[PDB]
Symmetry: D2
Subunit: 109 residues, 4 copies
């Protein structure tokens, strides 16, 4: 998957992928972007705690939470309630977009 | 591909796909969403002209243009200049999100 | 997924996909290959029964079984026991390959 | 792409991908399988020369050729002429299958 939708989370070891790029919520609590074997971006929160999770929230904020549910990193983009997306793009950028401006209304459960 | 980025276009016969779903700019100028062999949404512009193209614009508007570059359908979401995305989602909805709220800044050319 | 590995099955409504192509084991027991909304190949077993499953076997034979576990269509490629793959290719062909000639041996659970 | 078909090649820097796995023909002539940032298998031909290419041949042999078109590594699976596939699987194994046993015959240009 290349998208983390608002209301979804990445558990320890889970990730987004796109070609040779991997965006992973590591077990050591560091959120890192890799280009094959080379790290190119990170939250620099490795070794702070064990088994953290990443959450794309409905308020638009992207946050890393500790095992005790305390934030340890955030994009600082919390605002109006709505629908957002965190995308690992084909050009190697990781971007948050929102809110939803238009839709076909063809969603299913 | 499941995303049409702002500044990109779908030429006649091109499309977005996601599992069993296909969102295609048909040669008959009708933009249609299919669930395998069943059409579930369309712009209802079939037979109006031949070889139209779809454009996700930098102003946030999604537009179908005729071979003479005249609009024949639009999402009516034009506004502030920026970065947007049109996504064919895993839940079968087609949604426009934007503008960009945050990014890692790791893009390459 | 674009591959059905030997030892796996497609349940009623399940499928393989690749771009604008879908290879689906339909609820009406007909196994069909679609190019967007157009059927291009089928087992022609629609109407015989409901809820059939497709199985890529370890003997190399691809078989459609009825709800009573009786075969109603097969590729007739049964042979030596081994590892095989049924692939929905990027060129629109559906092909069975095997057995395995070589491997890195890096498989994990 | 998760498959390298017979008759195709991977140029320097090109690769196969599947989720968090990448199988790349590196510019340093070393063919390596990575699990995110960790190498798990390699031809061990790094440093021998620069700009080598990987070829999945119609005789079933997977070969790494130097810039002077001399083989420097091979799977030793050459045999009858036909159709084969080198697949980077979802279970992390890299495997060669062939020849083709059956097909729908729906291939197009
Ligand atoms: O330290 C073991 C750890 O190494 C790799 O992750 C790295 C660490 O999170 C950290 O020092 O920051 C690096 C990015 O700046 C990051 O690569 C991984 O191999 C990980 O799996 C391993 O646990
Ligand atoms: O404010 C509502 C919001 O609170 C919690 O998330 C927090 C906010 O997104 C923000 O101000 O930044 C915090 C991290 O710096 C973040 O925890 C959550 O409880 C969320 O569900 C709620 O909507
Ligand atoms: O409107 C775009 C939006 O549609 C779907 O979410 C829906 C909306 O959030 C809302 O009006 O209530 C619906 C029921 O709770 C909900 O499904 C999704 O497809 C979402 O991804 C999309 O952004
Ligand atoms: O009319 C030929 C045309 O049929 C199918 O497209 C359909 C048309 O665009 C129209 O009548 O509206 C339908 C959705 O409401 C749509 O499916 C396709 O098979 C197309 O390829 C073909 O040219
Ligand atoms: O307004 C600037 C914009 O103009 C043209 O696009 C138009 C607008 O997006 C909008 O008001 O709706 C029209 C269709 O109803 C659409 O054509 C383009 O020239 C675009 O590039 C430009 O930014
Ligand atoms: O900022 C998010 C944005 O980054 C990349 O686009 C860049 C910006 O639009 C801008 O500041 O100028 C850059 C050079 O013109 C441009 O690349 C893309 O990754 C884009 O998709 C993303 O939304
Ligand atoms: O309406 C029944 C059935 O129609 C479509 O499947 C078709 C049938 O299986 C049959 O007549 O053979 C066709 C291929 O030659 C095939 O398309 C689908 O729309 C299916 O979902 C539906 O149940
Ligand atoms: O022969 C062992 C094999 O038997 C059953 O599969 C059958 C064979 O693959 C073949 O001769 O063709 C039959 C359909 O025409 C097919 O059922 C299964 O029981 C299988 O598990 C077993 O390996
Ligand atoms: O050898 C290629 C083969 O490896 C894996 O399957 C394994 C073999 O079939 C065998 O030696 O026994 C193992 C345990 O039963 C089995 O995992 C898979 O990666 C398979 O896809 C591949 O063809
Ligand atoms: O720095 C050179 C080279 O390092 C990495 O590739 C490694 C080498 O090919 C070699 O020492 O063998 C390793 C596998 O056993 C392999 O990882 C990559 O970072 C590569 O891009 C780089 O050129
Ligand atoms: O034998 C015909 C074959 O020759 C060359 O490939 C070689 C063979 O696949 C094999 O015996 O092993 C060699 C590496 O050890 C390999 O080069 C090619 O010229 C090929 O095109 C041809 O089919
Ligand atoms: O038969 C399976 C095979 O079909 C297609 O390749 C074709 C055959 O190799 C052959 O009969 O000649 C054709 C023209 O040279 C060739 O296209 C492909 O779909 C291939 O991937 C597949 O294995």
């Amino acid at each position: 998957d290349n998208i983390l939708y608002s209301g979804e989370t990445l558990s320890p070891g889970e990730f987004l992928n796109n070609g040779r790029y991997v965006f992973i919520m590591q077990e050591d609590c560091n959120l890192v972007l890799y280009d094959v074997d080379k790290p190119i971006w990170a939250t620099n929160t490795g070794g702070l705690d064990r088994r953290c999770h990443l959450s794309m929230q409905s308020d638009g904020n992207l946050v890393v939470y500790s095992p005790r549910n305390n934030p340890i990193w955030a994009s600082n983009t919390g605002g109006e309630n709505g629908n957002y997306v965190c995308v690992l793009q084909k050009d190697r950028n990781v971007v948050i977009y929102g809110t939803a401006r238009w839709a076909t209304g063809t969603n299913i459960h």
